[PDB]
Amino acid sequence: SMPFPKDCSQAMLNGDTTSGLYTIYLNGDKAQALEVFCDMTSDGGGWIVFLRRKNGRENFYQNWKAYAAGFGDRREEFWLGLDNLNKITAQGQYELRVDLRDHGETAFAVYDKFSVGDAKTRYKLKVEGYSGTAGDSMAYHNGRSFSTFDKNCALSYKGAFWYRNCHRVNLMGRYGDNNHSQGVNWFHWKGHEHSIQFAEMKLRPSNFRNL
Ligand SMILES: CN1CCN(c2ccc(C#N)cc2)CC1
C-alpha cells in the first residue's frame, strides 16, 4: 500500500476495491488530507467522484465560496470543490468521466485530458479527447472559467458551471426541472427539456488504463 495516496487510483492499488469514502493526500502530503468518494467499479475504478446528483435533496444554487470549497454529503449529493479539483488535476495528467442515468437508460463521456486551473484563472476548465455515448457536450464549455451567481448564466439558470452563453452541460442545475435549460442537462444526450435523474463527474490519472 502507499501511505499517502494522492487520488483514488493510488488508494485502489492499495488493494481497496469497494466504492466509498477514502482519505487521499494532495501531492502525497500527509498535511493535505482530503476525504473523497472513490468509485472503484466503473471502467476499472480508481475514480474520485467530484459531483453526484441522484435525488434533489441538496441545493446546488450556491455561491463562489461554496463552489471553491465544496459542499454536501459525499455518500449522497455533493460537490468536491474547485480548489480541490485544481490541486488534484495539477498532480499529473487526469481524465474526466461522466456517468449519466435516467429512467433506466445510461450513457457516459470520457475526456482523456481534464484539468481545472487555480483561482487566478477563475478555475478555467480544460477538457479534450472525447469518447463515449452521451455525446460531446463538454466541448462547448472547453477553456471557460467557472461562474456562480455572485462571480449571468448561473443567475439565469439558478445553477453553477463553466458557463459560456450559456450551456450544453448543466449538471449542477435544478433537480427534476424539465423547463428549457433549467435542469440537470446533458444536451447531446437528452436535450434542454429533460432533467437527468442521476449524474456523476469523476477523475483519475489518464494513464490508469495501462499502468
Ligand atoms: C462547509 N463545508 C461543508 C462540507 N463541504 C464538503 C466538501 C467536499 C465534499 C466532497 N467530496 C463534500 C462536502 C466543505 C465545506
Q: Determination method here? A: X-ray
11 in ligand 1 pocket by Cβ < 6 Å?
no
Residue given cell 499529473 in the structure block: 92
Atom of ligand 1 nearest to the CA of 37: 11
Rounded-to-integer distance, Cα 160 and Cα 151, Å = 10
Of 178, 176, 175, 148, nearest in space to 162 by CA: 148
Neighbours of 173 (CB within 10 A): 24
83 close to ligand 1 (CB < 6 Angstrom): no
CA–CA dist 25, 33 (Å, integer)? 4
Instruction: Give strand pairing partners of 198.
Output: 101
What's the rounded Cα separation, in Å, for the pair 11 and 204?
A: 11
Q: Whose C-alpha lies nearest to ligand 1, atom 7? A: 70
CA of 69 to the centre of ligand 1 (A): 7
Ligand 1: nearest atom to the Cα of 36:
11
Resolution (A): 1.4
Question: Contacts by 73-78 with C-beta closer than 8 Å and gap 24+?
Answer: 74/21, 74/35, 74/36, 74/37, 74/49, 75/20, 75/21, 75/37, 76/52, 77/52, 77/53, 78/37, 78/51, 78/52
Nine cell digits for residue 120: 487566478
Tally of CB atoms within 10 A around 155: 12
> CB within 8 A of 192, min separation 6: which ones?
180, 181, 185
User: Which grid coordinates are listed for 52?
Assistant: 453526484
Amino acid identity, position 108: F
